[PDB]
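Sync notes, pocket subgroup
Present: LS, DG
LS reminded everyone that the earlier model was apo-only. Rerun requested with nicotinamide-adenine-dinucleotide included. Inputs:
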Amino acid sequence: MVRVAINGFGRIGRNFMRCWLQRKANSKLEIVGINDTSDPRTNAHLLKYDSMLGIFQDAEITADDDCIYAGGHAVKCVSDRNPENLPWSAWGIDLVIEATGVFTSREGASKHLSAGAKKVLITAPGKGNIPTYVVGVNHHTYDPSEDIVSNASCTTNCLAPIVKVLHEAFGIQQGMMTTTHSYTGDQRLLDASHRDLRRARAAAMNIVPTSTGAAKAVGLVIPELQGKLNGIALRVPTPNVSVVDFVAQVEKPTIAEQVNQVIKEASETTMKGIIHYSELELVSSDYRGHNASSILDASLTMVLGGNLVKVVAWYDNEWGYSQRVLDLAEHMAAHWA
Amino acid sequence: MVRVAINGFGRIGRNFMRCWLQRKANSKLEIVGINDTSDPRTNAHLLKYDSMLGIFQDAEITADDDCIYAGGHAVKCVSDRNPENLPWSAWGIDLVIEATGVFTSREGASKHLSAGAKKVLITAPGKGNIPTYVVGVNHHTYDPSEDIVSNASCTTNCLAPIVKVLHEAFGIQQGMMTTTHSYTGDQRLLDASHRDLRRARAAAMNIVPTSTGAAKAVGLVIPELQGKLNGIALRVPTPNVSVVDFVAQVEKPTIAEQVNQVIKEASETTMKGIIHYSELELVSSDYRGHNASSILDASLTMVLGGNLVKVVAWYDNEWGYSQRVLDLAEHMAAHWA
Amino acid sequence: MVRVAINGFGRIGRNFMRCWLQRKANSKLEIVGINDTSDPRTNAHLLKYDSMLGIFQDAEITADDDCIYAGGHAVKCVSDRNPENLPWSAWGIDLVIEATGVFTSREGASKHLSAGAKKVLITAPGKGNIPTYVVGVNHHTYDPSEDIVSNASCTTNCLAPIVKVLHEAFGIQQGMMTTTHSYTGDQRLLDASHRDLRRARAAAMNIVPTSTGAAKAVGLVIPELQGKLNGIALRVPTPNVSVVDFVAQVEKPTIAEQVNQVIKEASETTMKGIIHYSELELVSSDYRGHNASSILDASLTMVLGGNLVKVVAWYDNEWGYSQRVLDLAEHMAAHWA
Amino acid sequence: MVRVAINGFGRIGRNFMRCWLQRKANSKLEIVGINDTSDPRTNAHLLKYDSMLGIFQDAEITADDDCIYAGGHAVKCVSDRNPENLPWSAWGIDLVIEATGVFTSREGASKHLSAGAKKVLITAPGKGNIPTYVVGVNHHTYDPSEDIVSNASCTTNCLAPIVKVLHEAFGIQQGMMTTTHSYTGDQRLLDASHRDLRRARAAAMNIVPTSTGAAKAVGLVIPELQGKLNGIALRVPTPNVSVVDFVAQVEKPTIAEQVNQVIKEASETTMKGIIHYSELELVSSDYRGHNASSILDASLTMVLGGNLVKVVAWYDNEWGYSQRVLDLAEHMAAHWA
Ligand SMILES: NC(=O)c1ccc[n+]([C@@H]2O[C@H](COP(=O)([O-])OP(=O)(O)OC[C@H]3O[C@@H](n4cnc5c(N)ncnc54)[C@H](O)[C@@H]3O)[C@@H](O)[C@H]2O)c1
Ligand SMILES: NC(=O)c1ccc[n+]([C@@H]2O[C@H](COP(=O)([O-])OP(=O)(O)OC[C@H]3O[C@@H](n4cnc5c(N)ncnc54)[C@H](O)[C@@H]3O)[C@@H](O)[C@H]2O)c1
Ligand SMILES: NC(=O)c1ccc[n+]([C@@H]2O[C@H](COP(=O)([O-])OP(=O)(O)OC[C@H]3O[C@@H](n4cnc5c(N)ncnc54)[C@H](O)[C@@H]3O)[C@@H](O)[C@H]2O)c1
Ligand SMILES: NC(=O)c1ccc[n+]([C@@H]2O[C@H](COP(=O)([O-])OP(=O)(O)OC[C@H]3O[C@@H](n4cnc5c(N)ncnc54)[C@H](O)[C@@H]3O)[C@@H](O)[C@H]2O)c1
């Protein structure tokens, strides 16, 4: 049993905690420590009453000022912004889950390793050559001495299994993407001062565009496509779920039905539990809480000229990404060294 | 001076009326008739107080039950759903502006021609071989005996000048698009019964995807690209403005700076007043009421492998589209036959 | 066992069907007929995939063009706007549930009685002296020969138990209310033509005010307060749940804690299952799907001058109102005559 | 001419700057200093492109890293969170406009007085006995040696003229209010950790209630009603404008038409430019940018039992409040001591 911790009890942290509360019996992981910038009275309320996933129902949530009782299970909790003053060796922490969006560097994330933690899994595309791993693509090829691992962004975590399937079946020369992304917490609500100008504007009002390198992270997790994948993101006023457009330029020519057939059988042989395949005419809010990290929308797949394919993929960047974080954490627990 | 009329005083009709009130002096067009399914007391209020373009300021709006006084200028108004019982020859109507979204067929739109109107300009991609014309691409090549002309959709009206510039400068083999579209009036507000299932769901809550053939309408207005352009649309909860992604596969290789240079000089030589070029980091709501039919977003243009280009274009599908409708109407007034 | 039917398979109809699917075993009601203006293929999809209550999970939903199989249970379905051409006696219908928002008159609703139905329960404040009944206030005092009964509006259905408790405990001279109401389907999405001007404007953008007489319906269901209760409504861009403010002028003086005590014990003795009492600092979306028809918000109750009380009550106007409709339907099944 | 400064270039600061740019010629005020936590390159962009008031049009906005050129007029700009290290005497500052929402205490706001400023006008209901003044009620009765003055909240600034008119004409025993308030910048966008739990939840999703003492601030600015006015606030997902409900218990009995007559003539004699009177059926977004600090909605005013009145007032808490701030600043410039 592996004692794990959570740095930053935000959206990813609350979803990680809720996922572990829903996957408790099959777990080699026991969550024993969290730390947020809030007191332990508030974040227990925010855990129980999520305005996106409704009221939690299965287990009882309560807290006092030093611990949080989730379903009778106790969990410790502290508050500090310095990662160096944190009781890790005092709590016996193998794996800490970096989820603050602050410690993306190696030198930032390694502060927990210095302060007495054994491995760190950071839920962000980290700066510098941090080894990145996506469940369903290359979650096998990590060396267990790599204590500082990184899951990529949610967009990369959705997009990379589709790109893996299409690269194996057809071969990819180039590829664009344009993810229509739900608004995240970084954007200011009203027009307030912010480091980047396109995130400074109002979130509920605007399609704000942004440039991301998270398309290039597929070139990290798939090495032979690096420098060939690039794309932008569009933040629109939907709170939870998002869709990603993906334009690839394959070289083995095909039609629109065949790529759907390929991804449909890949959903049932190899990418089971990663890619779901849906031939329904659903819309965005029917994917709040879906377990797969990419639902391929079947009716919109199209091919022009044989060698130019477009797919779109629904994905929940708050629930499915947390599911892949927890699956990667359990998969590194199963190969603990 | 050409006496013109408006069928359906909806969003496109109110914006058309507001544009003509802002372009009155240079106009060979006099708006003399409208008809909506509402009484003349209500739609004058809806003209004056638009919850998107604010309160109209320049001229005074009032009405009684038979006429509407806009700035002292009188305009007639009636209410009927049958187009065959309408006083057109009684009012002397050369051009009627079909904007109900109902009469898209030739046989539907020709009911006004039968009922005593001389030309009809329909603001929709019509079913059947109706001659379509976009201002800035092929607004010259209409024969003036074509009395039933069609402007295309707003997405096509934005996309086609960019595709014209890139086809002339580079040559296009294939091309995808994915427009992130503002929600239109056809979608039901709450989850209500509707003919298409993906428009049946809630508009303020959801990214609803839809399949459109309005990308193929570029293949109508540019003949040598027909059957090579296809794309989908994403309706997100923004009320007014929208952005269109466009992935083309050019064959003459280039870089990302050069296509920006080409479109920048095309903004200043030929597409002036059609395509604006913006090297600012703006967001969506800074294009409410822009006069150009496509603002090319400069910072997001990218080229992979030399022969694969992506542009994005902001466009207002309620104001700029009305501007192109009024420009096409004046341009057919200038070549009246 | 009472064979019941649903006129209009909208929000109230889908919620009624979902409630009966969740309360099947304790039911003397069997739903055997529905009719909407849509085909039976579409509304089964709209039943299964609600963008407000998520995907239905307990039972399987499928359909063909003549019947709908909900969890193996078959239900008939037809489509007609004329209520006089409907197979009621051909289907053996005791109680039809009017939920179209069209047939509010006695002469409108009695068309089903003429066409071969035995009782009609209309889910609207009907025009004319239709006997109105609220579960938890006067659901006992109906005569079973009254075949045309009316449940009131959702605002009245929330407000009247609180007014009953405060009138019994303190006595009420006068009383105002101002319900901050979620947007309903009647409002046009964009600024479109509509019979009332304040509902003609955009729903996602605006606090639209409206005048309602649903406060006066408390004076129907409580007779000694008629002509003493009046209030307005505010429609704000939230899709599901709503809150009602209520200012009463009591005459027996008291403090803010005592009215909370009175309503707390009334929640546990008489209004159990009607009024829930919450001393949490919750917000709106934590009441999506709550079973009570009024959650009294405890922290906001205030009394000025001893004789002037203000309460606020969360209530779900799409789920709890359907629950009260189904409870009234079962309660009229238990006293069938 | 009075050299003035702005602490905190947020919503109130940007609106104050935009108002002074629109009221330049009649001004004894010259804006010479601002300070925000952002660099001078960003906030000039945020001044020019407001996603609520559109693009500014009259004057040109540019900046470099030390000054901001607004229409040729230069203004200095700095960045510091400590108010004690600020160049006030180096810049010659008579009046600084506290708008950070941080320095609400006397000891906090007096740091600018210590650091070399002569008067401070704070745009918040300050803690402690800070002299508060509302334009249109008691903007005359300030002593010019009171260097630390406070404008109240926007809700109080709207509500107090109506309460002044109704107290003079009828006399008020008690009074409630319930303002349906637009969401402000303090609320977290997604469910994030926050000091108060009801502001911790999502802003675009929820009617979040909050308790405010800004109703009691009317008892400060009108002394004989203190301890008689109290109310709550409802934050709904509208970005800009808000409406306030107001229930008073008058003692001189009257009807609903007479209070409308009283406020209509008070709009034309004394409260001109403060209270506008509208007998239109407008909605919320037709008050974006209105100059009056309260638009009385005429059709909703109601009186029950003669001695119980309810009014509702539209008001823009981002533009009209800035107008009253600038009017108070000019009115203290006209009586400089
Ligand atoms: N938002 C999404 O849906 C999503 C999806 C994929 C990945 N991510 C990544 O997850 C990370 C966090 O996302 P989120 O939405 O939970 O962020 P958030 O800002 O909503 O929550 C982060 C939490 O961490 C706290 N925190 C920040 N710095 C801290 C510090 N130094 N010490 C302690 N606590 C600290 C914050 O105050 C907050 O409580 C970011 O890297 C984000 O890019 C987000
Ligand atoms: N919504 C946009 O931004 C946009 C952009 C480009 C093109 N268009 C096209 O413009 C058309 C109308 O758009 P809209 O937003 O104004 O539509 P709308 O539904 O908002 O308004 C249409 C108006 O026409 C009235 N009408 C409908 N049928 C009628 C009939 N038979 N007789 C008389 N009046 C009738 C409607 O009641 C309403 O008043 C559609 O074809 C749409 O696809 C819309
Ligand atoms: N919306 C709410 O939350 C709520 C709450 C309480 C009460 N109500 C009342 O419930 C009623 C319906 O509400 P809703 O939201 O379901 O309405 P809706 O408009 O969303 O759905 C009504 C359904 O009935 C159909 N219909 C209308 N006229 C018909 C006819 N003549 N024949 C057959 N089908 C017809 C409509 O097309 C639609 O399918 C209204 O009286 C409303 O005031 C609504
Ligand atoms: N939001 C409204 O519509 C409204 C209406 C009336 C009154 N007010 C009051 O106005 C004040 C500000 O409102 P806002 O919407 O502009 O706030 P905001 O948070 O949107 O903007 C405040 C600005 O001040 C900056 N700031 C904060 N602390 C600072 C410090 N110590 N030094 C320098 N800069 C600092 C912030 O970073 C931001 O740039 C608050 O007291 C608010 O209650 C707001």
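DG: The longest helix of chain D spans residues 154-169.
LS: Residues 153-317 of chain D form a domain with the Dihydrodipicolinate Reductase; domain 2 fold (CATH 3.30.360.10).
Action: DG to write up.
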